[PDB]
Chains A and B, each alone.
Chain A
Amino acid sequence: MNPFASLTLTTLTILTIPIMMSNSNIYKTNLYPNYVKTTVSYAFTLSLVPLLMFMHTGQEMIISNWHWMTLQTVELSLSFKMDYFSVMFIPVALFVTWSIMEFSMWYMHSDPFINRFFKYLLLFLITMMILVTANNLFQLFIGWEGVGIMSFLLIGWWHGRTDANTAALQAILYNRIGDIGFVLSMAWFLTHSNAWDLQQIFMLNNECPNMPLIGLLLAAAGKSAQFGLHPWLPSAMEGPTPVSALLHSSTMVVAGVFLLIRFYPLMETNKLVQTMTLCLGAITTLFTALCAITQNDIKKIVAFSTSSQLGLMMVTIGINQPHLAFLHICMHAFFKAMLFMCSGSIIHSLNDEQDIRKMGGLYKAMPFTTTALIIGSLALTGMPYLTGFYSKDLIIEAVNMSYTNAWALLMTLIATSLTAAYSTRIIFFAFLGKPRFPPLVLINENNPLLINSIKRLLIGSIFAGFIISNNIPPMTVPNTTMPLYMKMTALIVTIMGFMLALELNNTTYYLKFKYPSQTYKFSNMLGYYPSIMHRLPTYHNLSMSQKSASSLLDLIWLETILPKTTSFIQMKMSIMVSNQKGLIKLYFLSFLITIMISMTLFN
């Protein structure tokens, strides 16, 4: 009966069987990674069916299957929301995960704990599915914290390295700052709407006040690495390249945008929070593209690209276009994951070398990676009729024709130009020059795992935008009529960014050298934000934690007040009372005094 619900639950359920088998004999053999990869491919194929059902009709469902508990008038149950967002995001995430697992089967071949690594990836995928399909705020919080814990465990994969542990703790810290706002929103909704269920929250909030929406915006900024809480995402490149391609590129970091999308009925009734979201996204995308423009580590360039794309998603949310933001999430998944896989292929082929100064002519040396990265860069810059076109071009048009900040619009356009610029930088410094790697050439692409994993996402990043856009129902009023110059603005700024970046990169061949300018130093050191904010606050916290809380108060003054004063007074009184010479002279004189006092005082 209605196979929709059975199929949707079966996908998530069969995602969990290898976790159960992780204690069986298969986990101790070398067939476990293929086991997990096959399970994920089967789950993707199964999840393709409810998407077809929704595409045909528009099937939507709520499944509240297990009743957890009841606090008087509040009923908490295990509920799944199988709506457009869930049934569209699950296939994309499963497809990307299947590609990444096939890639990791080649990339992490010499890692002793590859079974554990695969197991960790599956655990993250399960937690992310829990996050995406949740219907109440408690289940969503479960997924929210699960993905963060998996991120901590996978960033610090090489636990003997101090930097990996530092980066993992940094990610935990920033996401805890966001968790503060998540908890604020949960408390507000419980106190005012008497529910964590989404349906009652939508019913009872026709004009949502500022506090819950500001809490949700704080949580989204924390988990999607917006400008205030941004540096942890570039720091998270300490993990293995498959981790960077799966979690911190396309699937886990879009969780804040997803949270803002889930609560869009309440967001459109508030104009202040919309403006705050717009400004935050605009400043994030500009700042991160500006930082990316001068980076030399290729993974850092791609991570800053991801951060700028997330800022663009938040801009789209701010102009009241949530479905456009969801579409952009879906397209970015494909092409950003494939870009990270190409970067990891280069890194592995060059003996774990990540600096673009030390990779030269790779256009001919490794052609498949070259074509894949070229197609991915064209999709990222919004080349027409490619996957990124159908989201980025529409987003730019919507921001152009809207009642919004002029500054935010200008920053979005400049960020688009900078996106073209850093794509040019990657291509120019990784593929076009003469070789600059060590003489022992170990370049090799000929592994079927790598080729097939890259090729599936190549086909995706070519055709998925067209297919998905033509197969979904209209969810907004189109921008049919536009000035001709306004219609071409995205293409114009992309071409200008391409041309300026190419012209500036071609001058690196000239035989002249000069010291850098202040603007370059600002862009290279990430606006000095990681320096100051990772040295001034932390120090001033830790110092206080030792000087005042621990030493001055706990070890000195709290000790001085109650126990030490009591000891001192009792010891002094004991010395006063017991220090008597034993002469009956003074004793009997005192007896006379007390006799007189009792005679003349108590009567």
Chain B
Amino acid sequence: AFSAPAAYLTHQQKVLRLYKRALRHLESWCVHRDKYRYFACLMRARFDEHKNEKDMVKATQLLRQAEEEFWYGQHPQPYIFPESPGGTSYERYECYKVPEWCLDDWHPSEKAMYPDYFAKREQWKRLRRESWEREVKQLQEETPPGGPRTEALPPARKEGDLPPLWWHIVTRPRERPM
């Protein structure tokens, strides 16, 4: 989510992703902790018996039969964490998230309540206003010609600088706003 993606997944990443998926589905099959521990140790032993192999061709022939075997026995109803994309509370609090800019449209009788909050908000706004003019040029000179090659962003390198394109990441609504 936070990390920028690459152009492709290497062989090691694919193997590790299979290992995690297989362990999770084995846990979903083996409900009890001791049974899961036993079969997960067995799966670890099965997984690293080809850990030391050198050639790419058969190492890719493995992890293909492994995917087929996983898809045959994949527990059609695996356990999902409730906040995960398949969980029972995935986007439950999405309706309570309100953008910050809505506060700019409040009535003055509403802003009269919470004066300290809005003073701090004005401070944040002026900080953003200066930092943006710096950030545009920083990104302009830090980018290779022909455009970006990866959607990864640089940090700030000067003293009073801020990381380019920081406002909408720092001012996230919240995980549970209401």
Contact = CB atoms under 8 A, between A and B. Distances in A.
Interface of A: 112, 158-163, 295-297, 352-355, 357-358, 429, 433-434, 436, 508-511, 513, 515-516, 521, 524-525
Given A352-B88, A357-B31, A436-B31, A158 B95 contact: yes
A510 B178 CA distance: 45
A518 to B, nearest CB: 12
A446 B97 CA distance: 32
Contact of A355 (B29, B39, B79, B96): B79
Contacts of A521: 76
Interface string B77-94: 101101000001111111
A502 to B, nearest CB: 16
Nearest to A520: B76
B32 interface: yes
B23 interface: no
A163 B90 contact: yes
Q: Is the interface of B mostly helix, strand, loop or mixed?
A: loop
B66 interface: no
Given A352-B89, A354-B82, A525-B76, A513 B29 contact: yes
Contacts of A297: 88
Contacts of A511: 35, 38
Contact of A296 (B26, B38, B39, B77): B77
Contacts of B77: 295-296, 524
Interface string B95-130: 111000000000000000000000000000000000
A296 B76 CA distance: 11
In this complex, the member of B30, B32, B89 whose beta carbon has the largest number of chain A beta carbons within 10 angstroms is: B32
Contacts of B80: 355
A162 B39 CA distance: 36
Contacts of A163: 90-91
Contacts of B31: 357, 429, 436, 508
B33 interface: yes
B61 to A, nearest CB: 22
Contact of B72 (A436, A515, A524): A515
Nearest to B86: A163
A513 B75 CA distance: 12
Given A160-B96, A162-B91, 9 more contacts: A112-B178, A158-B93, A159-B95, A160-B93, A160-B95, A160-B97, A352-B88, A354-B88, A513-B39
Given A160-B95, A161-B91, A524-B77, A509 B32 contact: yes
Contacts of A158: 91-95
- How many chain B residues sit at the interface, stated as a range, is 20 to 34
B155 interface: no
B131 interface: no
Nearest to A110: B178
A101 to B, nearest CB: 22
**Interface class of chain A by DSSP:** loop
A357 to B, nearest CB: 5
Contact of A433 (B28, B32, B73, B76): B32
A343 to B, nearest CB: 13
B82 A352 contact: yes
Interface in B142-162: none
Nearest to A350: B82
B96 A112 contact: yes
A160 B91 contact: yes
B67 to A, nearest CB: 15
Contact of A161 (B30, B38, B94): B94
Contacts of A296: 77, 79
Contacts of B33: 434, 436
A220 B91 CA distance: 34
Nearest to A299: B88
B90 A161 contact: yes
24 contacts: A160-B91, A160-B93, A160-B96, A161-B90, A161-B91, A161-B92, A161-B94, A163-B90, A297-B88, A354-B82, A355-B80, A357-B28, A357-B31, A357-B79, A436-B31, A508-B35, A509-B32, A509-B35, A511-B35, A511-B38, A513-B26, A513-B29, A513-B39, A524-B76
